Write a protein that binds this ligand. Structure first.
Ligand SMILES: [Cl-]
Ligand SMILES: [K+]
Ligand SMILES: [Zn+2]
Length: 269
């Protein structure tokens, strides 16, 4: 299926065209230095890959975007719902060492120029946020936990309440993540999903058999953005499934737990 709203600058980059001034995108599996099981453009420092290879994969992505890795900010992602407003002082945090990545953080946004925000992915849902009026860019990492927590709606509530955004001005993109085609969950997950402040929670999951459910994590997040006040017309959901697209993405589910991570990135220049 189409890459839309992304454009493929092969091999390594998928770029959100309409936003580019914002630079936003998502990396692919290809064009890196990492050995199996991280072949080849692994960007995670937390998956026991060779550290120098990950920094070089990041150094290559930073150079394609004609930026410096010193102006990048990374998160210690704990699959909760903490959103950090990145400022100049946060520069280079987590970019070369995981020790300085933003602790227990899964949402990032900023209004400062030349400051690139970065989240790691290999099946979970990447969300992008852009307010062209307030000149805010943001990204959030939503697995099933972050989805049940509504980390995507908190980004919108944070822009509305702390930053003075009009929710009608906010644009959002949902990137490559695991589709319902390849994702089944137990009651423990579904009970937490169906407890979201959405009334149409069950539109995103079905029952295969008792205790096994198919779940579309992109759709719950899209529902949470519309609930939060973003007009549905201003949300674009990538159809790409990280499990299905074997030549493009790492997938935690397909690869049986030991694999690389792509990254989403956004920044203003
Ligand atoms: Cl439970
Ligand atoms: K249903
Ligand atoms: Zn799939």
């Amino acid at each position: 299926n189409t890459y839309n709203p992304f454009r493929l600058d092969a091999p390594s980059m998928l770029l959100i065209e309409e936003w580019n001034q914002v630079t936003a995108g998502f990396t692919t599996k290809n064009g890196g230095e990492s050995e199996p099981p991280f072949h080849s453009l692994n960007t995670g420092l937390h998956v026991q890959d060779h550290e120098q290879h990950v920094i070089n994969n990041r150094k290559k992505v930073a150079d394609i975007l004609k930026t410096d890795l010193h102006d990048w900010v990374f998160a210690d992602q704990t699959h909760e719902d903490r959103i950090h407003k990145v400022t100049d002082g946060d520069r280079a945090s987590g970019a070369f060492r995981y020790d300085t990545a933003l602790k227990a953080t899964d949402g990032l946004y900023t209004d400062r120029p030349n400051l690139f925000l970065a989240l790691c992915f290999a099946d979970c849902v990447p969300v992008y946020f852009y307010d062209p009026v307030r000149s805010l860019v943001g990204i959030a990492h939503a697995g099933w936990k972050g989805t049940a927590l509504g980390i995507a709606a908190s980004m919108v509530d944070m822009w509305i309440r702390r930053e003075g955004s009009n929710p009608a001005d906010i644009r959002a993109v949902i990137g490559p993540a695991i589709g319902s085609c390849c994702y089944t969950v137990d009651d423990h997950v579904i009970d937490k999903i169906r407890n979201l402040p959405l009334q149409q929670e069950d539109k995103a999951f079905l029952t295969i058999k008792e205790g096994e459910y198919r779940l579309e994590l992109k759709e719950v997040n899209r529902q949470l953005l519309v609930h939060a006040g973003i007009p549905n017309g201003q949300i674009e959901v990538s159809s790409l499934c990280t499990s299905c697209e074997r030549s493009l993405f790492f997938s935690h589910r397909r690869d049986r737990g030991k694999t690389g991570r792509m990254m989403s990135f956004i920044g203003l220049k």
